[PDB]
Amino acid sequence: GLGGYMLGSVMSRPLIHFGNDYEDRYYRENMYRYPNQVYYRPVDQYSNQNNFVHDCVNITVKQHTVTTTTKGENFTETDIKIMERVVEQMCITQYQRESQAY
């Protein structure tokens, strides 16, 4: 499940762009419902970034939907699409941090 998975520190949500004015407004209007921190395994346990990121995204999104729906929530396909895009950026950033602290 979450064995060997650390919880990274809070970080500012990535300002992603959707030129369609609506999704941009939907992202801004709903980001409070999305994660602001991620779950990851020590960076040394991965060969590259793609592996770290792919693993970090799946675990972060899943933990988030089960723990928040327990309290009462609803994640559409839009919500899921936006979340994966957002969490991916945060994971790449979490990767840099782990790689910087050697």
Binding site: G1, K62, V66, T70, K71, G72
Partner: protein, 212 residues
């Protein structure tokens, strides 16, 4: 097709155990958290705790962190609620929910040393208004059973229009329930109307045809 199907009714003695299950389907099981809710007879809803379907970790509300165990079988998309050292206070209907939106049908549990008692089923045929409105109402009397619940249907469920099945009532230490179905004067005694009952707790399942 999102559905949560819980195991059937349970009758247990004080001190015994029970493992109730809920088989989910229609969505990604491990993407939603599961809540467990208790409803004592006549009482309102009480939250027992939840299960992290991704992690498997269960969390118990204060009153349930003693004899309750929540578990999973991720592959089967099934949750389990175990109650050890049953006490009378445990008698109630328990529900599993997907987050906060969908609920299982619930499973009734009764705890008492009292011994199961099958129900007696009596047909109820007219004796008043024959065709003063071309309508005919017949009934089915299910009395003297224990414990709750019992299931009743007219003609194997094929007939379910203009049917009233009332809440059961405690005679003394036995429950009694009745049901009535109204049909057109022509339809009966022409066609046959039968009452179907089943009392889980005592593997009872009877049928009674209604005759003039």
């Amino acid at each position: 097709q999102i559905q949560l199907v819980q195991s059937g009714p349970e009758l247990k003695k004080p001190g015994e155990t029970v493992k109730i299950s809920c088989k989910a389907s229609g969505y990604t099981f491990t993407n939603y958290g599961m809540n467990l809710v208790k409803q004592a007879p006549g009482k309102g809803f009480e939250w027992m705790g939840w299960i992290n379907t991704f992690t498997g970790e269960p969390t118990y509300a204060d009153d349930f962190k003693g004899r309750f165990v929540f578990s999973l079988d991720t592959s089967a998309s099934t949750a389990y609620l175990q109650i050890n050292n049953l006490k009378n206070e445990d008698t109630a209907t328990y529900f599993f929910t997907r987050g906060t939106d969908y609920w299982g049908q619930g499973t009734t549990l009764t705890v008492s040393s009292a011994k199961t008692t099958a129900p007696s089923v009596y047909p109820l045929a007219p004796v008043c208004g024959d065709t003063t409105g071309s309508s005919v109402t017949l009934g089915c009397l299910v009395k003297g059973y224990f414990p709750e619940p019992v299931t009743l249907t007219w003609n194997s469920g094929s007939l379910s229009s203009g049917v009233h099945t009332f809440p059961a009532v405690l005679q003394s230490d036995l429950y009694t329930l009745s049901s009535s179905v109204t049909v057109t004067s022509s339809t009966w005694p022409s066609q046959s109307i039968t009452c179907n009952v089943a009392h889980p707790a005592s593997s009872t399942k009877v049928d009674k045809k209604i005759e003039p």
